[PDB]
């Protein structure tokens, strides 16, 4: 239902459009913050610098002059706004919250209790608040515990706390593979021709950096609620190629790529452990929360989803050029990406669990006679094995 052009924004794609009587007794949630502003001015500055230099040397086409003017505008509009949750992101959360309460009103009825946590990052806290405000508007009699901060780094920001992973992310063996893939997929000259006279005068490296920075600026704009669009700076095929390179970057640096040896995935086990613990506590009656919500990041969601072993999000593809066929970032971690575990009790008091990834039922590599419902016992056992495997992985890269 999403357009190809939307998809090619990858993890910058805005949350997609989501507009049997089974009623769950508990929901276990993890969501990325909603649509945000760019976090860094680096790409913008790079584009501006190249254009200003060309302008001083009379090297701009008319379209280039136009682009420069537009780039200066964005610089003004982004000023002081870096990394913030946009109006669109607030509305994404309201929609997710709203569909949840509409789908399962009994769960949030009367004096139901919910807890929410977030990282210390403002856009995640603001996302939590957009979400909680909706819940409370629908049922003010909810009891709500709201907390956030670095105390949750171990479960929400594990990607900052593992030294081996940090090193891998910064300078691991995925880097040269990514760089060569970009060199193969991205042809800067046709693009820069649009904006600059004598584009063939540019060194391949400066030309590539310019084009890559430009894609980055274009890709984030639909997340900002600013009524400006730059999708037409590039052809559909150029977007497709850009998307392939960034998709590979995400897969290799944050997911199940063989070059990563599952290190990027294994680091998420504390969050999977926490999910199981909170569900177990509700199930036993030690806790009587109706839902636990958690607000964090793409860097939280991607490895978490792979560690769960959902669908083929943990596929290990040897061939870089085959990755995009089997693993798609925009399907896993768009803006506002979320995972929900819905728990049910049947008439025989047996506990079942449904996993939703971006509000669509997800499959696990275990059997069930009633998909999309899985036996909680089987599921927990499976997840506990994933955690054990994760610890084993980390013990080798310690």
Numbering used by the authors: 20 to 38, 46 to 424
Quote the authors verbatim.
We determined that prominent gut bacteria express homologs of the mammalian InsP6 phosphatase (MINPP) and characterized the enzyme from Bacteroides thetaiotaomicron (BtMinpp). The Vmax value for InsP6 (178 μmol/mg/min) is the highest yet reported for any member of the MINPP family, being several orders of magnitude greater than that for the human (0.006 μmol/mg/min) and avian (0.7 μmol/mg/min) representatives (Ali et al., 1995, Cho et al., 2006). BtMinpp folds into two domains, an α/β domain and an α domain. The active site in BtMinpp is lined with predominantly basic amino acids, thereby rationalizing how the enzyme can bind unusually highly phosphorylated substrates such as InsP6.
